[PDB]
Design a protein around this ligand. Structure first.
Ligand SMILES: OC[C@H]1O[C@@H](O)[C@H](O)[C@@H](O)[C@@H]1O
Ligand SMILES: OC[C@H]1O[C@@H](O)[C@H](O)[C@@H](O)[C@@H]1O
Lengths: 175, 165
């Protein structure tokens, strides 16, 4: 099971994009490649050889899970991915992944810090978790579209509020 | 507020470290590649006014949904000689987030719901510009498919260097 951290620099995006802000998720605001990083484990043999924003090697049919997060681990600003699909606007590309799905599950025993000065020992408690998941169909290079909501912390309400739905067009390679 | 993601490749660590596993948090296992910070040889370097707040958020590559990590110590590392006093002491900072967003139960998760949740970060404030050697200790919890729960595998220690300029 290959996990991919999808990190977003919300502060940068809020600084740069002052127009074209969208709260219609079918018409998200396009953003450049400077504020997002996708990270996976070394055991999945990542490769900085190539032009792809992410590259790794795992057997066909392995499960892949994408976890979106702001730089505050969704504790201050936050992001939630709502779409991951093949991008056809850049010409033919490979069918590397099966359709992604929003996958919500119960984690019966998730650990959190306890109320001690250093947080130890951890307590375990149930919690819902979510990831966008798929499976590797075949080796190849696939252009993608990734859309997510960008939620900014509002100090007034102490709540995270939608600022804009956004879209990034990475390329991913399974070799 | 400067936020720093502290990411840990729990799968790599579990593959590479086969001895020296410790469940004594006062004698954690040292690690070299598998930890990164995202915001000289400084593992992290950034520039913000003195007295700004800094918040460190620890996470596995599954956002603590499969394996998980929890930082329990961030302190000045004195085993490599004198180093600068760049940060004030860190504290474990737990707060209530009245309105955290989560996906709703729709097919694509939209629109998001809001719900209360406890968050935590290790926080501090910049005392001065400089380069400080640090020690960072954390618990590494692995997902046990048998119980569907995350269980302590080892307490671990990484020794980064951070520069505020
Ligand atoms: O308007 C409020 C927002 O300001 C931005 O500069 C920050 O990146 C956000 O975290 C904050 O919630
Ligand atoms: O299989 C034992 C452990 O292997 C590691 O590679 C995984 O990251 C853990 O989730 C798992 O519990």
């Amino acid at each position: 099971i290959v996990h991919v951290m999808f990190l977003v620099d919300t502060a940068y995006i809020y600084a740069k994009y002052t127009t074209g802000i969208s709260t219609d998720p079918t018409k998200p605001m396009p953003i450049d490649h400077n504020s997002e990083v996708m990270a996976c484990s070394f055991v999945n043999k990542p490769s900085k050889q190539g032009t792809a924003d992410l590259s790794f090697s795992v057997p066909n049919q392995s499960t892949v899970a994408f976890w979106g997060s702001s730089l505050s681990n969704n504790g201050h600003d936050a992001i939630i991915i709502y779409d991951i699909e093949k991008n056809t606007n850049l010409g033919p590309t490979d069918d590397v992944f099966n359709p992604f799905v929003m996958n919500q599950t119960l984690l019966p025993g998730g650990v959190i810090p306890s109320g001690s000065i250093n947080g130890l020992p951890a307590t375990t408690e149930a919690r819902n978790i979510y990831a966008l998941t798929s499976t590797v169909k075949a080796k190849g290079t696939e252009n993608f579209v990734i859309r997510f909501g960008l939620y900014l912390f509002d100090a007034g309400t102490q709540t995270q509020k939608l600022w804009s739905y956004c879209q990034w067009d990475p390329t991913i390679t399974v070799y």
